[PDB]
Amino acid sequence: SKQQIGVVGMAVMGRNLALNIESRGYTVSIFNRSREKTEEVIAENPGKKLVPYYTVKEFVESLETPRRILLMVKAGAGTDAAIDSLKPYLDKGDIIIDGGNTFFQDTIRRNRELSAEGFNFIGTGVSGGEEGALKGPSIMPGGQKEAYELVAPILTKIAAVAEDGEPCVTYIGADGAGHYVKMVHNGIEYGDMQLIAEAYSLLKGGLNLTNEELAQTFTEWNNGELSSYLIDITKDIFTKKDEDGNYLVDVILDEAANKGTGKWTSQSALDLGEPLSLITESVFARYISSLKDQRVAASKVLSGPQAQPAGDKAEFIEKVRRALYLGKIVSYAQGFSQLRAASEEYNWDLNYGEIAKIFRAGCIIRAQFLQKITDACAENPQIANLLLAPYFKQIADDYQQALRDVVAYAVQNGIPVPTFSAAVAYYDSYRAAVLPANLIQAQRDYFGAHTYKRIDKEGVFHTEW
Amino acid sequence: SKQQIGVVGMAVMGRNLALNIESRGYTVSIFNRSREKTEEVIAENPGKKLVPYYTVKEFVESLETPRRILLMVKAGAGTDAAIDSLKPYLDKGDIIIDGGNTFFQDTIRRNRELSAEGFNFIGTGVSGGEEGALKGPSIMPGGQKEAYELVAPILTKIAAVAEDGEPCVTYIGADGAGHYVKMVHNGIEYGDMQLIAEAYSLLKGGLNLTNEELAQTFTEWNNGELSSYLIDITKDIFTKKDEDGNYLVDVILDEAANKGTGKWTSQSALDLGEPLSLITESVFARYISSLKDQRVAASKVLSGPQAQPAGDKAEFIEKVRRALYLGKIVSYAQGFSQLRAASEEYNWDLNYGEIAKIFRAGCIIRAQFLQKITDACAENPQIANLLLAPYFKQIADDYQQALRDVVAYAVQNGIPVPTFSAAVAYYDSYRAAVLPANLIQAQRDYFGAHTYKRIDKEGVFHTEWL
Ligand SMILES: O=C(O)[C@H](O)[C@@H](O)[C@H](O)[C@H](O)COP(=O)(O)O
Ligand SMILES: O=C(O)[C@H](O)[C@@H](O)[C@H](O)[C@H](O)COP(=O)(O)O
Numbered sequence: 049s050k051q052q053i054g055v056v057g058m059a060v061m062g063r064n065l066a067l068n069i070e071s072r073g074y075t076v077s078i079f080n081r082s083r084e085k086t087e088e089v090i091a092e093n094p095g096k097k098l099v100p101y102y103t104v105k106e107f108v109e110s111l112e113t114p115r116r117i118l119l120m121v122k123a124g125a126g127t128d129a130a131i132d133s134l135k136p137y138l139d140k141g142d143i144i145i146d147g148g149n150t151f152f153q154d155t156i157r158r159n160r161e162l163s164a165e166g167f168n169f170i171g172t173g174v175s176g177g178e179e180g181a182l183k184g185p186s187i188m189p190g191g192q193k194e195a196y197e198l199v200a201p202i203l204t205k206i207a208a209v210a211e212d213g214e215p216c217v218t219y220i221g222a223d224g225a226g227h228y229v230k231m232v233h234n235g236i237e238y239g240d241m242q243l244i245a246e247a248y249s250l251l252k253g254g255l256n257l258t259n260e261e262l263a264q265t266f267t268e269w270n271n272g273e274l275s276s277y278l279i280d281i282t283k284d285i286f287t288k289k290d291e292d293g294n295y296l297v298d299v300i301l302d303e304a305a306n307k308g309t310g311k312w313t314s315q316s317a318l319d320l321g322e323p324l325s326l327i328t329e330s331v332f333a334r335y336i337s338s339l340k341d342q343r344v345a346a347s348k349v350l351s352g353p354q355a356q357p358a359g360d361k362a363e364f365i366e367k368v369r370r371a372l373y374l375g376k377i378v379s380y381a382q383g384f385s386q387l388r389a390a391s392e393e394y395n396w397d398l399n400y401g402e403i404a405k406i407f408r409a410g411c412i413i414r415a416q417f418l419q420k421i422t423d424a425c426a427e428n429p430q431i432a433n434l435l436l437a438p439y440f441k442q443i444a445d446d447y448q449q450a451l452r453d454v455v456a457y458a459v460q461n462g463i464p465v466p467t468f469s470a471a472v473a474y475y476d477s478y479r480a481a482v483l484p485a486n487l488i489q490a491q492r493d494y495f496g497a498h499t500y501k502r503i504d505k506e507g508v509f510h511t512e513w
Numbered sequence: 514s515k516q517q518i519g520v521v522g523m524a525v526m527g528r529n530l531a532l533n534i535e536s537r538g539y540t541v542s543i544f545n546r547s548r549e550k551t552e553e554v555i556a557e558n559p560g561k562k563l564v565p566y567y568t569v570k571e572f573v574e575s576l577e578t579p580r581r582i583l584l585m586v587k588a589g590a591g592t593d594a595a596i597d598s599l600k601p602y603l604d605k606g607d608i609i610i611d612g613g614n615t616f617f618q619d620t621i622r623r624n625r626e627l628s629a630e631g632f633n634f635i636g637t638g639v640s641g642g643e644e645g646a647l648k649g650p651s652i653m654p655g656g657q658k659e660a661y662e663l664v665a666p667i668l669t670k671i672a673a674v675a676e677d678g679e680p681c682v683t684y685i686g687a688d689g690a691g692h693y694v695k696m697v698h699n700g701i702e703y704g705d706m707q708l709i710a711e712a713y714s715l716l717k718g719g720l721n722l723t724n725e726e727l728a729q730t731f732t733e734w735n736n737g738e739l740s741s742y743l744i745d746i747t748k749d750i751f752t753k754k755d756e757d758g759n760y761l762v763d764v765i766l767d768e769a770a771n772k773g774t775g776k777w778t779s780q781s782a783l784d785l786g787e788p789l790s791l792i793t794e795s796v797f798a799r800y801i802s803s804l805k806d807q808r809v810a811a812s813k814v815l816s817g818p819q820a821q822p823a824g825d826k827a828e829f830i831e832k833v834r835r836a837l838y839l840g841k842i843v844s845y846a847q848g849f850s851q852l853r854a855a856s857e858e859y860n861w862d863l864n865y866g867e868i869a870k871i872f873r874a875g876c877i878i879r880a881q882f883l884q885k886i887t888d889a890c891a892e893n894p895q896i897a898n899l900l901l902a903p904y905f906k907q908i909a910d911d912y913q914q915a916l917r918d919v920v921a922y923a924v925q926n927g928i929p930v931p932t933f934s935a936a937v938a939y940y941d942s943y944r945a946a947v948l949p950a951n952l953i954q955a956q957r958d959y960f961g962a963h964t965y966k967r968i969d970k971e972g973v974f975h976t977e978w979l
Binding site: 177178241242244245246248249277278281282284285288296297298299300301302303304305311314315317318319321322323324325328329331332333334335336337338339342343344345346347349350351352353412432433435436441444445448449452455456459460462463464465466469470472473474475476477478479480481482483484485486487488489490491492494495496497498500501502503504511513 | 525642643644706707709710711713714742743746747749750753755761762763764765766767768769770776779780782783784786787788789790793794796797798799800801802803804807808809810811812814815816817818877897898900901906909910913914917920921924925927928929930931934935937938939940941942943944945946947948949950951952953954955956957959960961962963965966967968969976978979
């Protein structure tokens, strides 16, 4: 008896995906380069249809052809070592699926090299954390279309499901398109977290809300248009008490770590010519949080204002709420515009509405908000920027003054609001028919003879200034 | 006879650097892959000690040994190919100076390869635009110290001199350190241009200043602490007209181009963990300017506010001036902190005070401002961040209210100020002993069990938040 799919890598993510697959009725082969972890998975999951293998050869031979092998191992050398360990036993047409958080260019390279050896390769993002991997993640696969069609029945069964019942998996595109989309999802997640962090700074610093008041605030926001997994868990965090009866969030060291996808999304915006200011400022905010020794030293030297009178409490809370929602809109408009630039550069012909649809559940950024994006893409598939969609244009019309008031209040109060500030600058720059780049171009021609174009005549010009 | 030095690359900077060298008395061999450009240089410079060559072999053979060859070719494949074409004709001991805007990692690789092959190599930045190349640029050389000493005399002859007479060239450090410092100079340049552009948007948006009034404003600012080449040329640009009487600044298409070093500085900050927000936002501002068709379309459908009352004209102009100066201070604090992170990462032991010193003249960012940086670094060579130096701390104390007032005004008026607003966010974040990253760490522990640290006990912790 052979299995339809096998999982290599029994750390928590691989183990949980194996259990998710097993829960849909499949018998699953499992293997780990270290036998101990495999033994542990078997001991902890009695009665489950997991079949453990202890050599790569036997693991590969246990699979029906074309083989479907899901790799959940360490990124980098561990992924190439896993692939190389499987190669001698594979047949032409077999399919290797890398579900790690791999940089997309590495997937493009692996896909091309393996294709020349006769093997298919699907690089797929998996979002949702350990719980999502076990119960229903958002899955973002890229690679050969026919290989995707051969694994789609399994992926659709294990994926999270949206409100309308659609599985949160779709064929993203060729080669590294799936890992590129996972990277952008992580960039967007960084932005959403930083936007929420600024809302917290404003509420605590401007109104002095207690943690119970913050939890109540985020609870109410989660009942409206901002409904999202990140806002929902934030209300839980502000409720959590530590032993001494005090809140846990207040003793956590304020140094935000990262595993690359945030930095990668911004480096890609820079390569592509995309103005991804919000997510990039979110990466820089984690970086400055990690310079805690310098911040503490600076705090003893540098001066600034203190919080200004906030005015009516309910009114201030509603302005921050509006600022947060419009800030999200701007961040996603920048991210989806980057998906378009990437699609063009890497020749993926991405379907933006289908991408938004699989972000409606399973992934970390899940929110009803993704349905508004799905809707905008449905009505205009090649929309250049989400800000132009009717729903978003109307929210900007109605909420921009609150965002402006929040930023002006924060700047006068000494409260840092990098992403709310970036949201306003982007909105005011994108809608400006004329920007001061005319002076920049004049300067470049003056000092470096770089030439410029004119608004009233075709051609390139150089002036002897 | 043989020439003392040769230059490959007759685009603007290379041709002018060859003329600079010739003006110090040397006879210079020149070569360009597009041979018609070499002919043009000769036809346009009769009587100068330039000797044109039309094959690489003859160009190399024309040089006195050990040979000195300065390459000023387009970055990338062009430079790689130029250097590969020279090799077969060279002798051990010859000296290759890459003065192009080469990515620093390419230089690190090339420096080891060429040195192992028996050549002396210097990867150097050259800054100054067309006029500084001709008259005296800032020069930032890296490589082995022995190689630097072989070219230090000629580079000292052609470099700009500061007002105090010190040459704007110094040994930067090993391998790719000189090209890295050149890259950072270009990032700072992007920042300074964008800060000036925002001042322009504020003066025009808030006071509706005419081009003549803009020129008068920048002229007055140039006579004070903001004195700089970029402000000096800006005051000229605002009064320049074309033959039909149009002010050039109003007919030039607002799509800012770029050749990479600005993008590279920001990609390096992202790799090094540095919060380089102002320069990075300046790069993104050039990118959004390039989406001209999109902006013109959006301007017809998205709504926004009108400019708010600016108040007393002189007071508004002074607040914008203070905001521009403090914004420059923040941008340079970010840039110099990145130089320290890069020095640590790539093992260069950079001398920050000496770098600031060679930027006092020659280069595009030249300004009396650089003397303040030089002084701060001379007093505290390993200062972590310039904002902490007495002079800069005092300016932050005195000018931050103007900068906060200008950003609030702009935001209420719908005038985009990405770098002024990034400056405030950075200042308020850098001085914050506690940031909301505690909530970010709690969220990451919640959805990804990433663990967190505590302020009251040792170790890493994981929590069941529900
Ligand atoms: O989508 C997900 O399920 C997560 O985003 C995951 O892919 C990521 O690796 C970390 O959980 C957060 O990213 P950072 O570690 O960089 O904060
Ligand atoms: O230092 C200099 O002399 C200039 O910076 C020089 O290197 C050139 O003018 C660059 O091309 C400008 O940078 P961008 O072309 O990217 O605007």
